[PDB]
């Protein structure tokens, strides 16, 4: 019983490591989505600046140029999150698993949002310059922004799940 039990204890320690690495990963996702969030808030603000009928169409085009810059930044935050070289959330992330015990398939699957840049239809689609696009834009970024935060919600909960998992985990370690 001591060999199997010791092996279990070691697996539990490795699980503490893995769960904490998961907390840090989901932290990275959180921060990147804080910045994309602040941006998409900003894009909303510019759509609201455009809806001002008194704002001339030329300056509406200028607003659009700012928006396009912000969109390039969404593409950048989407990229650049290479934790390990298999980065978080742009393009295709494959919904990995994090083991938190010592047995096979005793894992937390996590469901990072497949993409950020073009798929929050698109945020990059909108091209504010026309008023009719200014309001409809707000509909886009309104149904769309809350998907970011739906994820950040989920992941925050997953970080709680990690912490509770660890709190039980070190107990199983101590009892073993």
């Amino acid at each position: 019983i001591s060999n199997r039990l010791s092996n279990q204890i070691s697996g539990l320690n490795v699980a503490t490591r893995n769960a904490n690495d998961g907390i840090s990963l989901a932290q990275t996702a959180e921060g990147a989505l804080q910045q994309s969030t602040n941006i998409l808030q900003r894009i909303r603000d510019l759509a609201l600046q455009s809806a001002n009928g008194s704002n001339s169409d030329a300056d509406r085009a200028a607003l659009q140029k700012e928006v396009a810059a912000q969109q390039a930044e969404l593409t950048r935050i989407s990229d650049t999150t290479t934790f390990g070289g298999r980065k978080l959330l742009d393009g295709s992330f494959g919904t990995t698993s994090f083991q938190v015990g010592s047995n096979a398939y005793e894992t937390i699957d996590i469901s990072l949002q497949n993409a950020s840049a073009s798929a929050i239809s698109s945020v990059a689609s909108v091209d504010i310059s026309t008023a009719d696009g200014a309001q409809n834009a707000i509909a886009v970024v309104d149904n769309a922004l809350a998907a970011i935060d739906a994820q950040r919600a989920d992941l925050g909960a997953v970080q709680n799940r990690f912490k509770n998992t660890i709190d039980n985990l070190t107990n199983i370690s101590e009892n073993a």
Binding site: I23, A26, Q27, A29, E30, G31, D149, A150, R152, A153, L155, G156, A157, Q159, N160, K163, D167, T170, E174
Partner: protein, 45 residues
């Protein structure tokens, strides 16, 4: 007796309390209960 299972427990509760302090300081610096995801959905959503 080598394992010395009083220290072990003390180490645990120490690291738990220390996680709580590390976060507590994080809450004091910016002065926000909310600084990241690990709090909650009620935190952000």
């Amino acid at each position: 007796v080598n394992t010395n299972i009083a220290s072990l427990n003390t180490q645990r509760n120490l690291n738990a309390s220390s996680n709580d302090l590390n976060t507590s300081l994080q809450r004091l610096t910016t002065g926000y209960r909310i600084n990241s995801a690990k709090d909650d959905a009620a935190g952000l959503q």
